[PDB]
């Protein structure tokens, strides 16, 4: 596979992550002024432990079927076995989701986009388990601060998906193989974009699995 070959890959990952990305950035961005008044909060608050997970799980899970479109929809993850398919959405569909929602995060003032307006952590007070909303919060607050772009959260969250160290693969070269082509697409559209600085300031690895220890 050649320079141009791997050009395609780039445009392909942008334009599934453009499809399946589920909330359009403008939108995020619009919305960020409309903010949960203090009585809407106190109105989460007072909510069971069980709703706020209801809700939560309604949600990411409908996330997690937006990430299983975008994987469908890059061309190498359908010629990989069925059971590889399996794992590898088993094992990183919800990483794919908490980066995704960086895109839902604002720091300036520490909140995240939820049922339609911008919250803060006190939002989910109910669930009874604030240092993991927390670590969430900061996830987000330190990926923010690299300003990605929506073309480089594509070509990363593709990189978080096919990892051939995921256990359980029955073709671990052939999922090898279309990392590395994805490395180096990553790679490749950073030097196009003069992005090379981001490369250093990403997550170290397993730091998001490691979030998913408690989850
Ligand atoms: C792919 O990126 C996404 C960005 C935002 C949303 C939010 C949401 O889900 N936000 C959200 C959930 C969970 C925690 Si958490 C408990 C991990 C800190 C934070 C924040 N969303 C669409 C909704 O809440 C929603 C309201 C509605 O009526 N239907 O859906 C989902 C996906």
Redesign the pocket.
Known sequence: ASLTEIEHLVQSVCKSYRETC??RLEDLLRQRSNIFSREEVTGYQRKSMWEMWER?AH??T??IQ?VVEFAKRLSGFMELCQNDQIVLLKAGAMEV?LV??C??YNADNRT?????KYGGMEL?RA?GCSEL?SS?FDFSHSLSALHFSEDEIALYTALVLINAHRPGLQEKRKVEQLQYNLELAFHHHLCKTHRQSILAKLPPKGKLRSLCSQH
């Open positions: 589920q909330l939560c949600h990411l409908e996330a937006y989701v995704r929602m895109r839902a995240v986009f939820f049922e339609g989910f669930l909303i969430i």
